[PDB]
Amino acid sequence: RYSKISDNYSSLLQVSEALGRAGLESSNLIVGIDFTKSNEWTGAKSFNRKSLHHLSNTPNPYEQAITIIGRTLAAFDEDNLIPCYGFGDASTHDQDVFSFYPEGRFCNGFEEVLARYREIVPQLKLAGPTSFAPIIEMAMTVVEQSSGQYHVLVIIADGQVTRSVDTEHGRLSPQEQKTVDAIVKASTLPLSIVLVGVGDGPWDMMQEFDDNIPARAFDNFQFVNFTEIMSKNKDQSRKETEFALSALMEIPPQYKATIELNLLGVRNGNIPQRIPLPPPVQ
Numbered sequence: 001r002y003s004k005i006s007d008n009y010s011s012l013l014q015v016s017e018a019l020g021r022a023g024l025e026s027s028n029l030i031v032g033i034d035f036t037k038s039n040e041w042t043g044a045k046s047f048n049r050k051s052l053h054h055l056s057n058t059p060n061p062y063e064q065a066i067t068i069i070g071r072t073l074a075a076f077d078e079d080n081l082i083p084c085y086g087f088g089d090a091s092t093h094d095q096d097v098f099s100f101y102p103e104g105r106f107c108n109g110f111e112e113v114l115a116r117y118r119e120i121v122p123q124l125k126l127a128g129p130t131s132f133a134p135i136i137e138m139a140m141t142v143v144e145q146s147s148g149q150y151h152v153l154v155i156i157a158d159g160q161v162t163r164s165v166d167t168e169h170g171r172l173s174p175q176e177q178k179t180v181d182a183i184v185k186a187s188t189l190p191l192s193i194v195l196v197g198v199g200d201g202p203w204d205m206m207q208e209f210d211d212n213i214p215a216r217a218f219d220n221f222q223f224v225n226f227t228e229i230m231s232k233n234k235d236q237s238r239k240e241t242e243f244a245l246s247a248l249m250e251i252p253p254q255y256k257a258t259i260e261l262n263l264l265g266v267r268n269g270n271i272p273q274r275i276p277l278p279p280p281v282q
């Protein structure tokens with residue numbers, strides 16, 4: 001489907017212009033980066049047995065995804081300010097997020113996101129387990145504090161939310177419970193959530209995860225498999241446009257939904273204020 005569309009898109013500029021014609025207006029971007037220890041081994045097939053957070057003269061999958069999404073959404077970002085958070089390292093585990101800059105200061109453009117990411121990475125201790133509840137709750141808090149301006153939260157991760165050891169008997173983990181609850185509660189705000197999967201996975205459980213999210217006033221969640229798209233044997237430009245479209249094609253409909261439900265521009269009033277930890281760096 002996005003493959004069929006991308007066959008006509010040679011640049012991210014075209015994708016940006018298409019999003020605009022599709023109704024997307026002022027749109028803000030929040031980025032959350034997975035710093036769990038599994039990043040050390042989920043690059044076995046997709047990244048030459050290197051860590052997915054390996055730094056070098058070629059971008060790792062996190063840097064690549066940030067670049068494509070950032071370049072595509074930049075045109076809609078009026079203040080160019082991107083709240084950016086890490087989670088899953090030893091300072092946050094599955095409980096918190098940390099801001100890329102102290103005092104929760106936002107990054108100035110995706111270029112600063114990328115630069116600051118490279119500074120932070122060598123100082124982190126990767127940990128776990130995996131929950132997206134803190135990062136989704138952080139995004140909720142930012143949306144509320146902005147008085148309901150429309151945000152897209154892009155979570156880039158190398159593994160699904162941690163499951164129960166007794167998952168075979170239908171039991172949910174607290175990580176699953178809180179993450180699903182956060183997705184549902186986030187639908188009371190003008191907020192879209194895109195989960196970008198990098199690395200080997202496994203990601204075969206995501207369709208089912210999506211299907212099992214409880215009913216919401218609008219569908220505010222998308223999963224996109226970066227690795228599967230970028231592993232196709234076609235030109236770089238069209239792998240990039242396919243990924244951009246696969247991640248963002250549904251953003252303008254979702255935006256329109258937040259207007260129809262009168263979520264846009266208002267405070268919900270029921271949103272706990274999550275506080276980001278400082279970046280755990282020198």
Ligand SMILES: [Mg+2]
Pocket residue numbers: 034036037038039130157158159
């Ligand atoms: Mg992981």
Ligand code: NA
Pocket residue numbers: 027028029077078079080081082
């Ligand atoms: Na913004």
